[PDB]
């Protein structure tokens, strides 16, 4: 199927698109814009419906998916100052679309590495990575062990950049189980964290195979919290990565915790200083049955970035991460400007 724009309108995005075997359209979304607004036309991803034609500043739009389809990304986007829509581009998902291991690893890293190149400004040890693994009986030992191996190579992949972040390892079921705490003197020791990632097993949560994700995120909360104003709090990037099927049945809505976390990090609580770049949440669907609606509600929504992933075969991610380790590629440093206290010109 091909797209064409009326007169006076410019076409950006794939003009021709082909229906592929993965139940997805090839190329990028077609958008017919006139470039007459503060922000450009967000466009209408195939399968969705946009409600909002005004693209002024402070204006907004809303997206809805057809019946039987699940919306991935943001359902509402607001035109922010500086010409840039909030959240991320929506996408109508079905019940068999999945994601190829490469696609996942490719997008997960193109979003992670960037939020690390900036971390170099400059133990230690100025980024935290909370690994929350789901050990519920609804995942099975197969899709669980494959999730660890994937994490292992991820830690090595990160390490290949020569960066030493603080790690926090937690597996959860009916109750949360903390293996590594960022406050530990060994959290920044990649090898340390890896040895733990190996000692854990799927049989660890067999006696009480609940799925209380809420308490799991509460475990992470207590790790980033304070006993009541550490000197280095408004300079630390927090990254939460959790594997789950999104099928929680104990504790209620886990999202409430995410909000509490954002309140703790003073995020989205200042018009002039959003501080969104200080918290990223990645959610990987692992179990046989995965609720794309719930894992999308936890994952972050950042423009041009993907935080929700539904691994097809899994285990292949592990082999992809290992293949994507390249010590030759350097870590960028261009166009970097951080709000330092003194802020003398030439710092800006």
Partner 1 sequence: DEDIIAEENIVSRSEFPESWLWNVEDLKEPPKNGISTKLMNIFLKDSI
Partner 2 sequence: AQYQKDAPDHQELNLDVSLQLPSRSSKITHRIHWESASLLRSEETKENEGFTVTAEGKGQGTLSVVTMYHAKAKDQLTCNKFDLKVTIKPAPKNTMILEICTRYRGDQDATMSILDISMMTGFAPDTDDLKQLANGVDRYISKYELDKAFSDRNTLIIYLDKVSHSEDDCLAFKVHQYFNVELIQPGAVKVYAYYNLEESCTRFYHPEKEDGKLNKLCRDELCRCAEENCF
Partner 3 sequence: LFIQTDKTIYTPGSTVLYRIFTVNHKLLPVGRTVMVNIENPEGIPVKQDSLSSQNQLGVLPLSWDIPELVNMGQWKIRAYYENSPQQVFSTEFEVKEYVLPSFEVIVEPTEKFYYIYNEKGLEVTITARFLYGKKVEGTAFVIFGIQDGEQRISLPESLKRIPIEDGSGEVVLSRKVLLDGVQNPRAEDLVGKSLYVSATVILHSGSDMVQAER
Ligand X SMILES: *[C@@H]1O[C@H](CO)[C@@H](O)[C@H](O)[C@H]1NC(C)=O
Ligand Y SMILES: *[C@@H]1O[C@H](CO)[C@@H](O[C@@H]2O[C@H](CO)[C@@H](O[C@@H]3O[C@H](CO)[C@@H](O)[C@H](O)[C@@H]3O)[C@H](O)[C@H]2NC(C)=O)[C@H](O)[C@H]1NC(C)=O
348 touching partner 2, by CB under 8 A: no
Is 211 a known ligand-binding residue?
yes
Q: Convert residues 22-61 into a mask of x (bound to ligand Y by CB under 6 A) and - (unbound).
A: ----------------------------------------
Question: What Å distances lie between residue 228 and 231, 256, 257, 278, CA to CA?
Answer: 12, 22, 19, 20
> What is the rounded CA–CA span in Å between residue 322 and residue 319?
5
34 token code pair: 């006139």
Size of interface with partner 3, in residues (CB under 8 A): 9
Number of residues interacting with partner 1: please give it, by CB under 8 A: 3
Q: Please tell me whether residue 228 binds partner 1 under the rule CB under 8 A.
A: no
Who's near 111: CB < 8 A, 6+ residues apart? Answer: 280, 302, 305, 306, 307
Alpha-carbon span 39 to 176, nearest angstrom: 44
User: Does residue 19 touch ligand Y according to CB under 6 A?
Assistant: no
The alpha carbon of residue 213 and the mean position of all alpha carbons in its chain are separated, in whole angstroms, by 17
Tell whether residue 2 is a contact of ligand Y (CB under 6 A). yes
The interface partner of residue 114, options being partner 1, partner 3, ligand X, none and the CB cut-off 5 to 8 Å by kind, is: none
29 is in an annotated binding site: no
Q: Tokens at residue 182, please?
A: 């960022």
Q: Is 336 among the residues that bind ligand Y (CB under 6 A)?
A: no
**Shortest distance, CB of residue 341 to partner 1, whole angstroms?**
56
DSSP string, 5-48: --TT-EEES-SB--B-TTSSBSSPPPEEE---SSS------TTE
Yes or no: say if 308 and 299 are a contact pair by the CB < 8 Å rule: yes
Binding residues among 243-282 for partner 2 as defined by CB under 8 A: 271-272
Q: Binding string to partner 3 for residues 281 to 310, with x set by CB under 8 A, is what? A: ------------------------------
Half-sphere exposure of 172 (CA within 13 A, CB side): 29
**Minimum distance from residue 64 beta carbon to partner 1 (Å):** 13
Closer Cβ to ligand Y, 2 or 53, answer by number = 2
Residue 15 found at the interface with ligand Y (CB under 6 A): yes
Q: How far is the CB of 144 from ligand X (least distance, A)?
A: 39
- Look-up of token digits 């003398």: 344
Residue 9 in the binding site for partner 3 (CB under 8 A): yes
243 with 133: CB under 8 angstroms?
Answer: yes
CB 72, CB 87: distance < 8 Å = no
Name the burial class of residue 287, with classes exposed (0-12), middle (13-18) and buried (19+) by CB atoms within 10 angstroms of its CB.
buried
When the beta carbons of 18 and 102 are compared against ligand Y, the nearer one is 18
Q: How far is the CB of 226 from partner 2 (least distance, A)?
A: 29
Q: Evaluate whether 165 touches 186 at the Cβ level (below 8 Å).
A: no
Tell me the closest approach of the beta carbon of residue 93 to partner 1, in angstroms: 19
Among partner 2, partner 1, ligand X, none, partner that 271 touches (CB below 5 to 8 angstroms by kind):
partner 2
Contacting partner 1 within 4-33 (CB under 8 A):
4, 6-7
Binding site for ligand X (CB under 6 A): 234, 273, 339, 341
Binding-site annotation, residues for Mg(2+):
136, 138, 211
Judged by the rule CB under 8 A, the positions of this chain that interact with partner 1 are 4, 6-7
């Amino acid at each position: 199927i091909s797209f064409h724009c009326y007169d006076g309108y410019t076409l950006r995005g794939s003009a021709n698109r082909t229906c592929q075997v993965n139940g997805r359209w090839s190329g990028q979304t077609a958008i017919c814009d006139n470039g007459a607004g503060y922000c450009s036309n967000p466009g209408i991803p195939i399968g969705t419906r946009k409600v909002g034609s005004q693209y002024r500043l402070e204006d907004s739009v809303t997206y809805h998916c057809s019946r039987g389809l699940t919306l991935r990304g943001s359902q509402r986007r607001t035109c922010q100052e500086g010409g840039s829509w909030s959240g991320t581009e929506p996408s109508c998902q079905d019940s068999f679309m999945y994601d190829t291991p490469q696609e996942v690893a490719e997008a997960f890293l193109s979003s992670l590495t960037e939020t690390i190149e900036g971390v170099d400004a400059e133990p230690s040890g100025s980024m935290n990575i909370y690994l929350v693994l789901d050990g519920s009986g609804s995942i099975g030992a197969s899709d669980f062990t494959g999730a660890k191996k994937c994490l292992v190579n991820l830690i090595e992949k990160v390490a290949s950049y020569g960066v030493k972040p603080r790690y926090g390892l937690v597996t959860y079921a009916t109750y949360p189980k903390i293996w590594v705490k960022v406050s530990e003197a060994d959290s920044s020791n990649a090898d340390w964290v890896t040895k733990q990632l190996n000692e854990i097993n799927y049989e660890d949560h067999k006696l009480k195979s609940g799925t209380n994700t809420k308490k799991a995120l509460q475990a992470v909360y207590s790790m980033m919290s304070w006993p009541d104003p550490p000197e280095g709090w408004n300079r630390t990037r927090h990254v939460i990565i959790l594997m789950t099927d999104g099928l929680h049945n104990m504790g209620g809505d886990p999202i409430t915790v995410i909000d509490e976390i954002r309140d703790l990090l003073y995020i989205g609580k200042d018009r002039k200083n959003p501080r969104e770049d200080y918290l990223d949440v990645y959610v990987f669907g692992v179990g046989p049955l995965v609720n794309q609606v719930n894992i999308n509600a936890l994952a972050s929504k950042k423009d041009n970035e993907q935080h929700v992933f539904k691994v097809k075969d899994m285990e292949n991610l592990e082999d992809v991460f290992y293949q994507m380790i390249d010590e030759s590629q350097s870590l960028s440093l261009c166009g970097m400007v951080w709000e330092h206290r003194k802020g003398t010109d030439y710092h800006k």
